[model samples]
Target: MQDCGLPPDVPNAQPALEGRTSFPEDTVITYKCEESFVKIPGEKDSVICLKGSQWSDIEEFC
Candidate 1:
């Protein structure tokens, strides 16, 4: 499944990119914030592709 809307890259920061042509469940994607970034407060961990058509626990901005 596609992200309903993928978030834009934040100014002065970016995540190490991770995605796949085919999305399968139980895939965990780790995101590394770049030099200028701070992690979004509410989402404090890696993104997990859960059972549903969703990336679990990811946040949009710093």
Candidate 2:
């Protein structure tokens, strides 16, 4: 299985990037906002590492 690079950085949000450095295809990377931050509706949540070494674009961030 191919591995994906680190998840893209987000402002005021934290991602599940502290565990594995290599993300296999179909891996779902969830995101969270900081204590003082909140996510925008339908804009922020999670992204997936799909095939073709491409990551789903994040719609929005906190």
Candidate 3:
């Protein structure tokens, strides 16, 4: 296993799910709708293991 290059100070830089690794090849990360915001079900919150980089989904709050 390699060290996931996530710094400890970045806000919301991790996933809400438990028992998962931050490394892209280990698991998938998803986000929840924040205050006054909503999420479209089945929409991708983020893709962790796809390709070779960790990516965050574009959040929509309206």
Candidate 4:
């Protein structure tokens, strides 16, 4: 199984969502940003693994 990139320090993102490990399909993962960072609009706060190992929505740090 594959996972989205996760920071070593963050280990993922704010709120401590998913991680780099084994996962099946339709896995939902919610993400957040630090105070220094802001979330981009037009995107969902939660991301779900679609088809195989792809996030249904992507998060952008600004």
Candidate 5:
């Protein structure tokens, strides 16, 4: 499988890269709401790198 180009932008959310770059297929990228923000119930907090170098869509995170 090909590696995902880059993580998709989520409004009011931050990606936990942990100082690393380059995401491979099947990579699970966790996200956290910025300070003073909160997570929405029933919504996913993480996105996965899918085949064809695509990241799962995140409708909302805060």
Candidate 6:
């Protein structure tokens, strides 16, 4: 797994997949915030592989 540099308090912030093995298309990565944090709507969830070589969508911390 790799850290996506999502804030220190974010839970499951690291990438779900690791190394060179390719994730199939339409892969989704889920995240949750630690204790006091909440994820912004529309930005909170992310999908990858479908877009091809791009990082999952950026979510807001509040």
Whose lDDT is greatest here? Answer: 5
CA lDDT of every candidate: 0.51, 0.82, 0.45, 0.53, 0.85, 0.46
**Candidate 2 lDDT for residue 12:** 74
Report the lDDT tens digits of candidate 5 across residue range 1-62: 48876687888999998776788889899889998999998889899999888899887769
Clash pairs (backbone) in predicted model 2: none
| Tens digits of lDDT, candidate 3, 1-62 | 33243322222333465554456454555555555555566555554544445443444422
**Would you list the clashing residue pairs of candidate 4?**
none
Model 6 per-residue lDDT tens digits across residues 8-42: 22443443444434555555555555556666655
Alpha-carbon deviation at 53 in model 3, angstroms: 4.8
How accurate locally is residue 13 in candidate 5, as Cα lDDT from 0 to 100? 91
| Cα shift from native, residue 9, model 5 (Å) | 0.8
Candidate 1, residues 1-62: lDDT per residue as tens digits? 53322333334444344564444666555565667677777664455555546666544545
TM-score of each: 0.47, 0.81, 0.42, 0.47, 0.87, 0.41
Across residues 1-62, which tens digit of lDDT does each residue of candidate 2 receive? 58788887777778877668888889899999889888887675898998877888885577
> Which stretch of 10 consecutive residues in model 3 shows the poorest summed lDDT?
5-14
User: Which scores better on TM-score, 3 or 5?
Assistant: 5
lDDT of 1: 0.51
Per-residue lDDT of model 4, residues 1-62, tens digit only: 55543322232346444445544566666667666676767755565666545556554633
| Candidate 6 or 4, higher TM-score | 4
What value of lDDT does candidate 5 attain over all alpha carbons? 0.85
lDDT of 6 at 41: 58
Q: Please report the TM-score between candidate 6 and the true structure.
A: 0.41
Residue 32 CA displacement from its true place in model 1, Å: 0.9
